Design a protein around this ligand. Structure first.
Ligand code: FES
Ligand SMILES: [K+]
Ligand SMILES: [K+]
Ligand SMILES: [K+]
Ligand SMILES: [K+]
Ligand SMILES: [K+]
Ligand SMILES: [K+]
Ligand SMILES: [Mg+2]
Ligand SMILES: [Mg+2]
Ligand SMILES: [Mg+2]
Ligand SMILES: [Mg+2]
Ligand SMILES: [Mg+2]
Ligand SMILES: [Mg+2]
Ligand SMILES: [Mg+2]
Ligand SMILES: [Mg+2]
Ligand SMILES: [Mg+2]
Ligand SMILES: [Mg+2]
Ligand SMILES: [Mg+2]
Ligand SMILES: [Mg+2]
Ligand SMILES: [Mg+2]
Ligand SMILES: [Mg+2]
Ligand SMILES: [Mg+2]
Ligand SMILES: [Mg+2]
Ligand SMILES: [Mg+2]
Ligand SMILES: [Mg+2]
Ligand SMILES: [Mg+2]
Ligand SMILES: [Mg+2]
Ligand SMILES: [Mg+2]
Ligand SMILES: [Mg+2]
Ligand SMILES: [Mg+2]
Lengths: 170, 113, 65, 50, 72, 108
RNA sequence: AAAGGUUUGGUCCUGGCCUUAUAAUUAAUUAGAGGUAAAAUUACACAUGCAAACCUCCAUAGACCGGUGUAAAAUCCCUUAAACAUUUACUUAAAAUUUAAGGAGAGGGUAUCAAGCACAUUAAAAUAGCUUAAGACACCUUGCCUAGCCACACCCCCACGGGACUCAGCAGUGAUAAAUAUUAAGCAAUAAACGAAAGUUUGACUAAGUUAUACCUCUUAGGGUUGGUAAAUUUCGUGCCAGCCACCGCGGUCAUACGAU
RNA sequence: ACUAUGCUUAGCCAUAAACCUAAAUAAUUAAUUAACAAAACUAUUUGCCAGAGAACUACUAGCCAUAGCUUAAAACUCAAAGGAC
């Protein structure tokens, strides 16, 4: 049995379910939540369930969490321009908090798709090379082309050993 | 007005020391994923920050701005803001003084003092 | 950490001095306390020599000017 | 689009601030009533104790 | 449970105590010499520090304390 | 251990693999120094043929000579290999029959 | 791991060791040809030959290719600036290739290495600080990041200087080691250097030589094993001896366990 | 028979089968018998363990401790040791 409560939170599939990819402006997200109370239950669940998913998709964003410092829970984002975006998450479900932050400071699906395509621009199927980078190492693998001499012996007339013998014979 | 090279253009941390002149030692923490356990833990870093007015006290949360030119070997940030003062917090949501999870001044009232 | 204003009055009235917890624990034993005393003394001597050298160097320059 | 989203956020914070003042107002009325009753019990007990 | 594992430790400790009893005087001379070497290593380590710092004589009014001798 | 304790310690520390009589090498060449007999610890009974050798590394080891009958003598050269003789305690090397001075057992 | 064998008079539990799978090197025995890949004891000392030229004088090149894994926890990934011993363009901009200062995060061992001893800040030159059990410092070990990268180039970390005075370029030799490729041909191909060019040069490379180390196609058959784990023994000899076993174990006269068959 | 000693006044030493062999805290008593013991079992946090012997040992550092305490290996040996029945 995996240790801890809700061990599914410690699986790569769960971490990849996060959908909030912050814009490049977002630099820090401080989370102020209270460990005791009734109006801060959603914030506590947001720290428990959602903060891992947010960090997984935003490795360069500093998430620092403070406990029992204020009467109510809130989220404050620090942007590169110097703006500070305060969010009030009291009486809000953990799912509601995720949707709110996605709207205001989350990249759109169109933007994310474009980046994925650009990343793969330099991979070409026709390119030959090692398996890590290319589909086929050599043209011998292609159908109809002369096969590799190791797998299939070449005709004698196509061999330097044979050609050199003829030149001596000439 | 080119910006710093350092990755940490904006860092939040706690002032863990203030015994250097016009400098505040700040401990920042980030979340790092343990690859074996797939759980996040806290990796903490120390940042020297220029406290021009010596307005920082141990235990207060602060925001640092990366300096364009390193002031010294270790001082590469300045104190942008004091997010939370130690024991003197002001609620961001309501704006009233607080002492923990309680209001020193009720939000219903309008003291304007 | 919660009410700094109340904290300041209580310490002044009750006459209680509050020292903040030291970040790092320092071990103590005869060998360490003796080496740590010399190291502090050696530094001070080196710095005292530098101050004397700076004064002599500046004094010579002033005479030349 | 950033400016519009930052305007919507401030409105949401004001909308929730309004609810907080409405909720906390109700508490002041009820808690005030309880405080008066509790002070009455103290007055009765305090006189008896004297 | 039986006391068999305790009996092994019982014999090990008894035999060790009699071995220490036999060679008690030899052990004393070993210790006084191990402490003397422990002091010289302490003194030398202090000389290394000031010599590296650039001092040619130990700091004024300094005498390495003798911390391993019978001072108490 | 808790997840915090597993994180602070990480994977189990692994004692290093100390080498054996051959020093992690397939074979060694040695010069015979003496030929003697060793008695197999009880409950076995035999007069096992062994020899001391100075290996190329420079150390000296005791090597069991397998087979029925050997012609080894002092100053001979042999190729030793690994493999302990279970009954003979301390004998962690064996001689290879058919290499250098040592020869194959004469078949009967 | 789909597991198995082995604690005991016996059972259960716990627990180590070992077996079964895969691959490299060396060794024993054995071996036809053909194709292909790889070639590897040693930063110990090196006989001999060769490995850098081109070219109307100036220049350019010999800073590459090739070799080794010396040193070093050495690094990876990323940011910023700058040049270039460059190219191609313009009289001003696109690249390739480097250098310097850095840091979100990641990065070997020993904590019986627990303290380091100046490792800080301010900028009237004062303050007493800086790193460290969230592992500093010390010591030890190792090339890693693998379309490749990093370091090294006889030794003294460097190379003014000094010394024990140069194959870690190809081939080859001595010594050393369990470890064994030709002191070979060609510049025709591709790559590099030079030239305006026809061209020239190249132990890079290409085509061969050597070798069951691997793979492929074939044709001869040899090696080991046969108590259990674990597929498979007849007769005889031996008699706790001679010998055998990876583990448990076998051998004291009807031994499926040793030797021959 | 008799002493050190048990007692008192100060200081030192810092060890026990110091074991109720069961860390502390908050639960739960059904969805729940390896054996034995004092029923099972979840969460939180720290400490500790990784075959037996060698070893309450060697070396190191600290300590009023000097035949001492805490800290604590390796070589080497074995194919088991151990717990309950
Ligand atoms: S690998 Fe393509 S010809 Fe051999
Ligand atoms: K026997
Ligand atoms: K087992
Ligand atoms: K060098
Ligand atoms: K050519
Ligand atoms: K056969
Ligand atoms: K007890
Ligand atoms: Mg009993
Ligand atoms: Mg004993
Ligand atoms: Mg038993
Ligand atoms: Mg061979
Ligand atoms: Mg190269
Ligand atoms: Mg090395
Ligand atoms: Mg030690
Ligand atoms: Mg040489
Ligand atoms: Mg050099
Ligand atoms: Mg050579
Ligand atoms: Mg050379
Ligand atoms: Mg070879
Ligand atoms: Mg040209
Ligand atoms: Mg028989
Ligand atoms: Mg067998
Ligand atoms: Mg047989
Ligand atoms: Mg008496
Ligand atoms: Mg007494
Ligand atoms: Mg104890
Ligand atoms: Mg008791
Ligand atoms: Mg004891
Ligand atoms: Mg002891
Ligand atoms: Mg000791």
């Amino acid at each position: 049995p995996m240790k801890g409560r809700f061990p599914i939170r410690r699986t790569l599939q769960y971490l990849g379910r996060g959908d909030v990819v912050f814009k490049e402006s977002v630099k820090i997200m401080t989370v102020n939540y209270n460990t005791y109370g009734e109006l801060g239950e959603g914030a506590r669940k947001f720290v428990f369930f959602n903060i891992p998913q947010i960090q997984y998709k935003n490795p360069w964003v500093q998430i620092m969490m403070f406990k029992n410092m204020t009467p109510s829970p809130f989220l404050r984002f620090y942007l590169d321009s110097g703006e500070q975006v305060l969010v009030d998450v009291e009486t809000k479900s953990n799912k509601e908090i995720m949707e709110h932050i996605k709207k205001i400071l989350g990249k759109k699906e169109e933007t994310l798709r474009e980046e994925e395509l650009e990343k793969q621009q330099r991979f070409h199927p026709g390119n030959f090379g090692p398996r890590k980078y290319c589909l086929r190492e050599c043209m011998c693998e292609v159908e109809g082309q002369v096969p590799c001499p190791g797998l299939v012996p070449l005709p004698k007339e196509m061999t330097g050993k044979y050609k050199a013998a003829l030149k001596a014979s000439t | 007005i080119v910006r710093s090279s350092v990755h940490a253009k904006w860092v939040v941390g706690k002032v863990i020391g203030t015994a250097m002149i016009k400098t505040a030692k700040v401990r920042a923490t980030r979340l790092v994923l343990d690859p074996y356990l797939l759980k996040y833990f806290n990796k903490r870093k120390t940042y020297f920050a220029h406290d021009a007015l010596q307005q920082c006290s141990v235990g207060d949360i602060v925001l640092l701005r990366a300096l364009p030119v390193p002031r010294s070997k270790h001082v590469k940030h300045e104190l942008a803001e004091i997010i939370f003062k130690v024991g003197r917090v002001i609620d961001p949501v309501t704006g009233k003084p607080c002492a923990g999870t309680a209001y020193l001044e009720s939000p219903l009232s309008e003291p304007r003092e | 950490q919660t009410n700094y204003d109340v904290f300041e009055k209580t310490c002044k009235e009750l006459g209680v001095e509050y020292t903040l917890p030291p970040l790092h624990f320092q071990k103590v034993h005869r060998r360490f306390l003796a080496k740590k005393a010399l190291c502090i003394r050696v530094y001070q001597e080196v710095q005292k020599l530098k101050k004397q050298k700076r004064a002599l160097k500046a004094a010579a320059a002033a005479a030349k000017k | 689009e950033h400016r519009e989203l930052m305007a919507w956020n401030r409105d949401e914070n004001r909308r929730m601030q309004e609810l907080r003042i409405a909720r906390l107002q109700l508490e002041a009325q009820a808690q005030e009533v309880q405080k008066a009753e509790a002070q009455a019990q103290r007055a009765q007990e305090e006189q008896a104790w004297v | 449970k039986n006391v068999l594992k305790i009996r092994r430790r019982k014999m090990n400790h008894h035999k060790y105590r009699k071995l220490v009893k036999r060679t008690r005087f030899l052990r004393r001379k070993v210790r006084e010499g191990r402490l003397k070497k422990k002091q010289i290593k302490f003194e030398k380590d202090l000389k290394r520090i000031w010599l590296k710092a650039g001092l040619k004589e130990a700091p004024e009014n300094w005498q390495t304390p003798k911390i391993y001798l019978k001072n108490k | 251990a808790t997840l915090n304790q597993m994180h602070r310690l990480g994977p189990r520390k692994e004692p290093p693999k100390r080498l054996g009589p051959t020093e992690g090498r397939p074979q060694l060449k040695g010069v015979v120094l003496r030929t003697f007999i060793r008695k197999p610890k009880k409950p076995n009974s035999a007069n096992r043929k062994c020899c001391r050798v100075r290996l190329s590394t420079g150390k000296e080891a005791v090597c069991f000579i397998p087979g029925e009958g050997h012609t080894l003598q002092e100053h001979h050269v042999v190729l030793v290999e690994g493999g302990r003789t279970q009954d003979l305690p301390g004998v962690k090397l064996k001689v290879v029959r058919g290499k250098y001075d040592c020869g194959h057992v004469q078949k009967k």
